[PDB]
Structure formats: structure tokens, C-alpha cells
Amino acid sequence: MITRGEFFMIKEMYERGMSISDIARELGIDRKTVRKYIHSPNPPSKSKRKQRKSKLDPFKPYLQKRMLEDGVFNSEKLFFEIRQQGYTGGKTILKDYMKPFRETAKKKYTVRYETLPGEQMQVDWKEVGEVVIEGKKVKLSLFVATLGYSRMKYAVFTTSQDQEHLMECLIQSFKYFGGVPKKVLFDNMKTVTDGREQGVVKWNQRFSEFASYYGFIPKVCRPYRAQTKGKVERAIQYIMDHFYVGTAFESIEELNFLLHRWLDQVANRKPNATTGISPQERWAEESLKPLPLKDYDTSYLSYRKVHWDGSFSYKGEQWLLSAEYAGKEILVKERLNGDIRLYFRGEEISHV
Amino acid sequence: ESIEELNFLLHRWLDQVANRKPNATTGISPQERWAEESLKPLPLKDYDTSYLSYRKVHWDGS
Ligand SMILES: [Mg+2]
């Protein structure tokens, strides 16, 4: 088992012409050993041995059954049990054998990553809570979109977290940043996925079409791990401890106006604590893909029938349609702003 | 402008016309008295002249 260096030295000194016996004398090795190593391929310094029997082998299946069906992980309890069965050794071997079965405590070290310019964006929601806006109880939610390289922040308040609202907020973010990223990171929302099909993710077909339309590649971090999108979560903490702490409002339009003004004043103006530069300069450094001229229409699409007289009803509303549109089927495109339009076989109805 | 160069020329001036400037009363350059003074040998090594300050490392390794 002469080590790498010893074997190299033996072979080299032997090939140099030095006599073998005095080589052995110099290196303090037996002459037979040195001579055998002369005609050897490479330094031998490794011995392979397979596993061997231990004391806790007969009890091992029983302990494994205890762990995997009774959920017992108390080394003292298992030791006391098996001691009656016949075991006589200490607990160290038991702990060593049982350690792999134990759950892996979550780490505390946190890797840091710096995405390339115009290469990544992050999105998330924040359930603000229930408020009485204009005498109406609604569930307010905050949508936050954080750029990855410039740390920009766009935000907007909404009353619902429907796929339509998500897509519209993404449109607003893309317009705000003057382009679309090459990658957009969400969490595992059903408006973007439909579960992990054996490790792989199954994208919602409509959302996949939307992404292919705007060209941005979706990504999802992982189940029950929000660290991977720390930028946007920390931006949420920033906004909810700086803007929505004492600000008072009565209309969501007013709140959104105040939020945009606040962002453009301080949030996207104050230099970041890590990049140490105003986010707008980095934004100017960003290179996002151009937006399409026509935005992906995100509006509720329903089919309704006009009554005999010509009175058409949608939600708690009523219209008066010409007699030619009575008893037929029409399309009611409801934009998220409340602009309802009526269509009949492509044509647009001048609804009264 | 560099204060280091100013101190370099200061050291030259001290060696030239400050430590070799005889006093009117004594009439002898102070260097001779310094030579005859008792300057016990210094330990030949310098006690560390580096700021010592503790810092906690965040769980980010920072
Ligand atoms: Mg979320």
C-alpha cells in the first residue's frame, strides 16, 4: 500500500538506473515489495472491503417497522424495547442507524442569485383582507410584479384573484416596464398550473396560450418554498409596511392612483440596499422584449339570449335591443373596467 | 497634496535641521545626549497596530 508519491518515487528512481536494493533501503521498503511494484500499472493505495455483520442486525427489521408504522423516533424508547428482546449494546449504534430515517431539518443558509438584465421577473399576490369600501365588503388583494435585475416594483389593488385579473395585471406590469421579460416566476397557483404531474408541472392551457402570446416563459418555484421569489415577497413587506399602514381611502381607483404616485416617487426612486443604485437607472439598463400592439383581451365572455320583446338582461342590468335581435343568441363581452359590449355574429349591437 | 509625502519631507527635515540643531544654552546637538541616554532595547516586534472589531454573519453568509 505504498502511496501515490512512494510509488512514483520507486518507479522513477528505478527507471533512472539506480539500483533496486539501495532504492528499497532509501525508501524503507522490503526488496520483494519494491521489486513487485516495479512491474505494476499504478500506485496501489486502496483496499476494498464489503459490509460486515453487526449487533443490531436481528432487531433492525423490527426497529424499521416501529419507525415506519408507529412513527416512533425516540431512541430511548426503542432501545428500552429491544433491550428486552435481547440487545446488549449501547445506544450510539442505534442512533447512527436511525439517523437517516429522521426528517431533514430545514437549512438556514440561503443562496443568493443575480439574474441577467431583462431576463427575469417575479409575480405574487397579497391578501390584504376584508374592507368596507363604499359600504360594500370586498376582499382586497395586492398584485406585485418585481423585476429581477433592476428591482423595479409595479403594484395594483384588485377585488378578485381570477385568472382574468391575473392576466390583466400582468398586462399592466408589462406596459409599466415598457416590455415583457424572458422569464416570469410565479408560485403554484391554479390560474397558472394544475398540479405536479409526477414531478413535472402541467400548465393551464389558457395561461400557456397567454404566455406564448406575449412570449414570456413561465416558471414555478416549488411547493411550499417562497424563498425562491424573495424579491417580490420582500417588496410586499415593503409596500404593506410603508404604503398600506395608515393611508386611508374610499375608492380603489384612488388607492391605485396613490400607489402609483408613491411608487414613482420613492419605491422606484430610493436606491436599493443591495444593488446600491436607483431602480430607474437599472430600468434604463434593462432590455425587455417589445410589447404586441394589441393586448390579449381579458374580458368575461358569456352567451345570452334576448327575450321575446327585445329586453336583454345581464347580471342586475337591463337593455333595450332592436326587434331584429329578439329571441336570438348574443355575446356579452364584459371588460374588467365594466365596459359591456354586445356582439351578434361578429357585428356590434348599438344597445340602448 | 498627499500627506504621506509631506511626512516624508518632514522626516528628512527632522533628520537634517531639527534633531541636529544645537540648543543655545547647552550648545550641543541633542543627538549626542540621545546617544548617551538609556534606551532599553525594544522587543524587536510590533504590538499589532490593526483595528480589531467583531462582526456577526447573517444566515446569508454575509
Ligand atoms: Mg402567492
Swiss-Prot record, chain A:
Q: Which UniProt keywords apply?
A: DNA recombination, DNA-binding, Transposable element, Transposition
Q: Name one GO biological process term.
A: DNA integration
Lineage, uppermost ranks: Bacteria, Bacillati, Bacillota, Bacilli, Bacillales
Pfam families referenced in this protein's UniProt entry, alphabetically: HTH_7 (PF02796), rve (PF00665)
Where in this chain does the record put each HTH IS21-type domain?
Answer: 5-67
Function statement:
Involved in the transposition of the insertion sequence.
A GO molecular function held by the record = DNA strand exchange activity
Give the matching Gene3D superfamilies: Homeodomain-like, Ribonuclease H-like superfamily/Ribonuclease H
Q: Which stretches make up the Integrase catalytic domain?
A: 113-287
Q: What name does UniProt use for this protein? A: Putative transposase for insertion sequence element IS5376
Q: Which family does it belong to?
A: Belongs to the transposase IS21/IS408/IS1162 family.
Q: Which InterPro entries match?
A: HTH_IS21_transposase_type, Integrase_cat-core, Resolvase_HTH_dom, RNaseH-like_sf, RNaseH_sf
Q: What top-level branch of life does the organism fall under?
A: Bacteria
From Swiss-Prot, chain B:
Q: Record's family? A: Belongs to the transposase IS21/IS408/IS1162 family.
What protein is this chain from? Putative transposase for insertion sequence element IS5376
Physiological role: Involved in the transposition of the insertion sequence.
The residue ranges crossing the membrane are none
Q: Which organism is it from?
A: Geobacillus stearothermophilus
**Top-rank taxon:** Bacteria
Signal peptide residues are none
